[PDB]
Amino acid sequence: GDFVLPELEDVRAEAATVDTRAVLALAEGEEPAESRAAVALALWEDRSIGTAELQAAAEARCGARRPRLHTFVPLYTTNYCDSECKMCSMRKGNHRLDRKFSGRKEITEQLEILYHHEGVRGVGFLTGEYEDKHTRLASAFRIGWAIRTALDLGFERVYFNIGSMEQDEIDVLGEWIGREDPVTMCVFQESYDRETYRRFMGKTSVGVPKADFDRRVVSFDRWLDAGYRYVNPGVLVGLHDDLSAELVSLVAHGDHLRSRGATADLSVPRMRPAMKSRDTTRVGDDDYLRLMSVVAFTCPEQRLVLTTREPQEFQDVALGLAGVISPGSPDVAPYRAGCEARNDEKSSQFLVADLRRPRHILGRIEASGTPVDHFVNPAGEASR
């Protein structure tokens, strides 16, 4: 009943049988005979189909989706972590980081700034991942409180991203919400290749909690077992060299979740500068746009998430492939009324490319002709 990784050579054989031209000719809402992972792989590898042309087809295939876009802004509630991801500044072994923790007052204040000054109605809560059972339970407790507090303030959509979760940790978080609340669990597998995964996340059985690949990947299945609905898998683009392998696995994971009745967003964040202990693969814009396109096309009801990891000029080109736009900063309690958010290298998880205020970024998107749901521009008669 739990997700099982696809056999990449099996998908390759099925991809060899799809007619990619016929696929592009499909009407919106119409579904290929072959599996999504096989169709995505075939589109990816058929270089007679230009990336620009794939992108236009993906945007059209997703064109009917309503709302076109919605938003959430991240709120990192702490930058403590017990794990050791080599591409992340929050890794426990990074003794250079200034560690911070938001209490009741600070979390509430940040939510009020986001709500009234940035005009947003979507928020995400983030933490590190912790090793011992009591710390994981206490973290779930705190984040559960934060989710409930946000919902009560009038946030209409809440994400959380707090590491892998076992059944009893979900129990503790779940006592804060209802099974029908608009709450999405985020757990990016980073890489679905077990060998690349171990290279960046570490080896198991040594107090490094995220090194357990399996606990992480079945977290959505536990969430669904408990009766919840919204989930957000992802790949960290730049870890594994073979992008065709990751897109096959992510699309396979999305497809599994869909079969279980879940609503899934799909995230493919691209690497940003951080205090790393191993370096990564820089993925060019064309490969990245091609990847987003084949995922968006074959998974048309599963929204891609685009974040301010990316610079303004890239958002300009890619926004049409996305279903979620998420501006913000990965620093602890970084927001302040009337000021740009902090992204201090001394305390941030990584450095973002776009530090413009969410309400500016989202306002410009709306002014260009795309409304953003969960955004209320704090303007005119809706200004205080």
Ligand X SMILES: N[C@@H](Cc1c[nH]c2ccccc12)C(=O)O
**Spatial distance between the Cα atoms of 239 and 271, rounded to a whole number of angstroms:** 8
Q: Which of residues 124-163 bind ligand X (CB under 6 A)?
A: 124, 126, 161
134 beta partners: none
With respect to its own copies, which residue has the nearer C-beta, 118 or 169? Answer: 169
86 marked as binding residue: no
User: Token pair of 326, please?
Assistant: 């998420």
Q: What angle do CA 66, 3, 187 make, to 5 degrees?
A: 60
Whichever of 114 and 275 has its CB closer to ligand SAH, that residue is 275
Compute the distance between CA of residue 166 and CA of residue 257 in angstroms, rounded to an integer: 18
Applying CB under 6 A, which part among 38-46, 78-86, 246-254, 304-312 lies near ligand SF4?
Answer: 78-86
How does 138-168 read in b/e, with b if 16+ C-beta sit within 10 Å? ebbebbbbbbbbbbeeebebbbbbbbbbeee
- Does position 81 interact with ligand SF4 (CB under 6 A)? The reply is yes
Give the nearer residue to ligand X in terms of CB position, either 127 or 307.
307
Nearest-10 Cα torsion for 120, 258, 294, 72 = 10
Residue 373: CB minimum distance to K ion, A: 6
Flag whether 276 is marked binding.
Answer: no
Beta carbons within 8 Å of 339's beta carbon, 6+ residues apart: none
Q: 126 φ, ψ to 5°? A: -130, 150
- 140 phi, psi to nearest 5 deg: -55, -40
Q: Is 44 a binder of its own copies (CB under 8 A)?
A: no
If contact means CB under 5 to 8 A according to the sort of partner, which of K ion, ligand X, ligand SAH, none does residue 129 touch?
ligand SAH
Among 190, 255, 265, 310, binds ligand SAH (CB under 6 A): 190
Is 309 annotated in a binding site? The answer is yes
Task: Classify burial at 109, counting beta carbons within 10 Å of its beta carbon; exposed 0-12, middle 13-18, buried 19 or more.
Answer: middle
240 binds, among K ion, ligand SF4, ligand SAH, none (CB under 5 to 8 A by kind): none
Partner interacting with residue 186 (select from K ion, ligand X, its own copies, none; CB below 5-8 Å by kind): ligand X
Structure tokens at 291: 């990847």
The answer to whether 318 contacts ligand SF4 (rule: CB under 6 A) is no
Q: 76 a known binding residue?
A: yes
Strand order in the sheet with 266-267: 70-71, 324-326, 304-307, 266-267
User: Binding mask 59-98 vs ligand X (x if CB under 6 A, - otherwise)?
Assistant: ---------------x------------------------
Is 87 labelled as part of a ligand binding site?
yes
Partner whose binding site includes residue 122, from ligand SAH, ligand SF4, ligand X, none (CB under 5 to 8 Å by kind): none
Q: The tokens 């991203």 sit on which residue?
A: 161
The residue within the footprint of ligand SAH, chosen from 15, 88, 247, 295 (CB under 6 A), is 88
Q: Which residue's Cβ has the minimum distance to K ion?
A: 375
Pairing of strands 73-76, 122-126: parallel
Nearer to ligand SAH, 81 or 321 (CB): 81
Q: What are phi and psi of 131, to 5 degrees?
A: -90, -55
Q: From the CB of 184, what's the least distance to ligand SAH, in Å?
A: 13
Whether omega before 327 lies within 30 degrees of 0, making that bond cis, reads no
Among residues 299, 175, 297, 290, which one has the least CA distance to residue 244?
A: 290
Any known ligand binding at 190?
Answer: yes
Choose between 136 and 309: whose C-beta lies nearer to ligand SAH: 309
As annotated, the binding site includes: 76, 81, 85, 87-88, 112, 116, 190, 210, 216, 272, 309, 349
As annotated, the binding site for S-adenosyl-L-homocysteine includes: 76, 87, 190, 210, 216, 272, 309, 349
As annotated, the binding site for [4Fe-4S] cluster includes: 81, 85, 88, 210
